[PDB]
Design a protein around this ligand. Sequence first.
Ligand SMILES: [Zn+2]
Ligand SMILES: [Zn+2]
Lengths: 116, 56, 132, 562, 148, 146, 56, 72
Amino acid sequence: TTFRFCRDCNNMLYPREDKENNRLLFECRTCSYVEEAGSPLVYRHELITNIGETAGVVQDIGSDPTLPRSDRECPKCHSRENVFFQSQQRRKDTSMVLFFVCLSCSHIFTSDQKNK
Amino acid sequence: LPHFSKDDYSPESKGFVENSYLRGLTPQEFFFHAMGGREGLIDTAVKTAETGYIQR
Amino acid sequence: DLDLERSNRQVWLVRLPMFLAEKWRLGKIRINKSKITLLLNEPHEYDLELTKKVVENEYVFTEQTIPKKTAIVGTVCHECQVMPYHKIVEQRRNIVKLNNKERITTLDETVGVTMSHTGMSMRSDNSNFLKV
Amino acid sequence: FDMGGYFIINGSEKVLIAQERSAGNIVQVFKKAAPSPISHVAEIRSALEKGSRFISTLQVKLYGREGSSARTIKATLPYIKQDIPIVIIFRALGIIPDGEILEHICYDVNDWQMLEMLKPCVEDGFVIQDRETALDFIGRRGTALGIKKEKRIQYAKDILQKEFLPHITQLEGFESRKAFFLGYMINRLLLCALDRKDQDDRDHFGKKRLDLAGPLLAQLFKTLFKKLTKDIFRYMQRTVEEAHDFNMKLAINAKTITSGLKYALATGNWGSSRAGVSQVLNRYTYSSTLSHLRRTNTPIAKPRQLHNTHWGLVCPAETPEGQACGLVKNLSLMSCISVGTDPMPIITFLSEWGMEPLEDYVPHQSPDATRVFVNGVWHGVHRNPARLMETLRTLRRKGDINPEVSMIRDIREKELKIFTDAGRVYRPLFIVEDDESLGHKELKVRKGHIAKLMATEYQDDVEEYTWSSLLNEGLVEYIDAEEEESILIAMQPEDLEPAEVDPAKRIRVSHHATTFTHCEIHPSMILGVAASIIPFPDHNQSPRNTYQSAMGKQAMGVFLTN
Amino acid sequence: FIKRDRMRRNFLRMREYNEFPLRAIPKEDLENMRTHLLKFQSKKKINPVTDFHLPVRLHRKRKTRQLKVLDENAKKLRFEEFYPWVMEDFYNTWVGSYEAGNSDSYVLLSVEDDGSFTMIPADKVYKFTARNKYATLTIDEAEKRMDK
Amino acid sequence: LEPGHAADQEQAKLIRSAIEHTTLKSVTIASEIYYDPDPRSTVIPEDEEIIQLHFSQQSPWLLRLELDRAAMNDKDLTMGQVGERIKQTFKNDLFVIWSEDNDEKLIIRCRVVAEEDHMLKKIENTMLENITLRGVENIERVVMMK
Amino acid sequence: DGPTMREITETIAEAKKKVLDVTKEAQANLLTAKHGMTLRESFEDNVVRFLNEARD
Amino acid sequence: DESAPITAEDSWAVISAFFREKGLVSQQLDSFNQFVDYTLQDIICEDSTLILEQLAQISRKYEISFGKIYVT
Ligand SMILES: [Zn+2]
Ligand SMILES: [Zn+2]
């Protein structure tokens, strides 16, 4: 999870346990480059994935003619001109919560009234 | 169809034919009705083709 | 006997347009202190963009297992690109999209002549090829 | 009234039915619901534009089911037996480090999931770390006829330079480009494995290519010409080997081409590979010949069911009943088939406006660059797709570029596909402009152009104002099924364009949509030839329109006057 | 509600700066030497040839009557020169490869002592790769070690 | 059902909770691995509360995971009975701790007597797939019908 | 007759208002699906049920 | 005026100007004509050269190549 690469070797840094000082390290098995550890975290699976629903957001998203138009105002700039679209994460259990994209400050504010 | 907007869940755009055969149908409804007709023909053909084998 | 001459020489690499490049296959560069142009000989002036400012690990060498005579020229100093009466160049760019090929030619003769030249025509030899 | 469009062999009017096949040079991904260890398959049928007719197809397989760990990726290679991991191939292409590999596969450093799934491939890629050991690895894995190693490493390199990815090119030195394209295919496979994209649909009519007499006679005349050359050379070797005189009448034979073309256009076979291509012309009536010549066939998702991509291209009613139901199709009245142009002037024109080549691409220095695709070949990216797309569209409407070329700009996918290959089915549609002097949107064609057009029509003093004059002025444009994904079409012009009831008329939709880019010429044109004879088919059920469309091909009448 | 077929009668009845010159080097030097380009693939920013130390060396490492296929020119001349060069000392190793695609249009503006510049057309372009940093390998040992 | 316990919803909820297959992966939001060499003391500042309670030679590597409270409700479960299941699964080779239902964040931590990470990752697969919390095999989506 | 046509227009109109209300409640994530189906399945069952009820 | 919007019936005229240009069966004629025009020269030119290699003991060779094809 967000691992680093070696210098010159550019290979991934496998975790190495430091038994002398009893502390985590990051090694490269090709060479002798071992750096310290700034965090004890190593691996995170994250089963239930909720990211990717708002995928593919570009600076030129406001010039898409296929996308719809709404009249709801933004909570920030208070602009009623925005473009909404549902989640980009395609899955069976994906909710139909709309995603509002303002055409002024480019803020992404949703329409969920239960959890915000 | 490329004649409606994206992420449209309105019943009219999803296949509801609110017109009747007395006043005619719109193109986006006649297309879906043609899909249902072809599906009916194919389904009947398969049901007969299997019905014969079952009969034998 | 490869020998590095200097490498201290600084060279600038240029990505030129095709008509002027094929023409080069002289002008005067005007360095404006962060915008530089080029006054060719009569003819156009050309702004050259600072494409890549830092350009390390790139060098230039020349050549005079089989070892050959190798000489080192200089380091690459800046990555550049020449940018461009422009309506004539735009029309020439629109004009290059008009290339075509010749169609098949239909022989219009009385057929009987060509059909006579097809099969037996009482005319042999007349050409030395695989005659041993 | 004789429409023509057929052949005459032995006094019989033979017709070449339009064949249907799938397109190539497009990366496709599919799922495997079987207990096979492969979860997703990334197929891509690579072939050149003209010549040889390549059949080699590259496959990138993802092993390991969902839930289990150690999900490695292994892609097969032609002439190589067992499958080879993607990272080892990256080592064989000249890329040794792994950070560059992850930099070519995944173009976003912020995403940790794809990089996380790359780990096992980086482990096996740790096992084999050298380019020479990778070339010797592929040399020892597949193709054992080299025997010697020194010839199997260079032979394997020549495989990676020639047989590997026949498209793009086959020269030496294009390994960086193919490395970027390969990393793109892996990005599509893993990106499809993360449930971010659905399985690639094969029923999309835009991904299908039709074959008329052009392609068929191209394959046939190609093979017959090859056989002719081989036979001529055989006569040459016989002449020089037996030591005799040469004759032009015994070397070049004409019964090979005559018997090949006459036999292929005479029988149903096109050489069983293909059968039922040539059928006798049905002269029962005039609409039977019209609906017979426009008949398209599909060789044996459900292909029989009517898909949503058949709007305006395939008649939704005219279809036979029985075993061949839904496999036979009929062209709608304004649907045509592309013929193919030349992609070289377009590729040459793109690089003049700053289109960076692919081999100079760095995803860390230009992450927001839009990739440019020409017939599936990735030539490079561009950091300004707006002005470039506007330029290509303005030059496409003026008549410079052939209107048969269909260009699509997928925003979410961040791609710009360009299709100029033959076989695509398109249909003409009007052009809608929003910037007008009235304050709202309006069509490009006005009433003056209609007045000049009708003046020329009823005059035939003349003004030479025809359909081509309407096309060159940017008033009507052809649209296939691929570009139809990125346009908004309006049905009636004077009913959906302007902004705002007897109970006998039908209820219609609203005009809430503003970004109407195109407009339908007329909806009644979506029907075929046989369904066009039906009076008021809207008020009639569809299967009756189909039955009447079937009975219209056998009624008594007058086909011709001669 | 009827088809208007009388349109023929209706249509018939209706109708500070610093300027420095450029020069072309005589073609004798172009006939003597061919200019190629250098590009490294080791990520390290610096890497000059002075830090590459010395001595720098860049060197390139019976049947009857039958049938031949054919081939052309430039592709054959580029195919026969399938020996890539290498620069080393006596240790650092750099092995280059052809780039081909980066030919097209590349003009060199070599800066001399004066403000003027000397333009030279680039013949080819090569990508040098730093080889044998770690120093290890195996062949058959890796083929048997990969079978576990 | 039985004629004696008919027209009863709670009893049918007990029967459904007695046959419907449930697994540990069902309740798992996410899992994460930590390097924590000292067995008793934990670098993590939050879990210290757990450290204070559930305590009052082993692997330096920590396996940790979080459960959905909603999953603990829909599928009736107890952090206790879960830890019981794992303890009677792997027996004594894997030490186990689990957070309380009162905790607004459900936490479970485990350790063992080359690198320890790979061993932990194997145990992760065993935990998610091969543990069934309750219910008999090949039973899903039990629907109440009147 | 006229009044019957207006009663049919209002019958369909009420069903359209119901599908719009369930559509807004589904877009606001305020409707929890029952056991055995997801949100989209229950939504499609409600829309199809209302449309068939209005047609009947 | 000349800059007035068109109607629904007017569209029919456009369709006429379509069928006057193309015809009901124009795809077969255009594809076949393009085949005869370009496909013949492409097939002939893409693989016309064949050479015989003759050995003697001095080497010798022979060549036959096809050029512009002619249709009647
Ligand atoms: Zn390293
Ligand atoms: Zn805003």
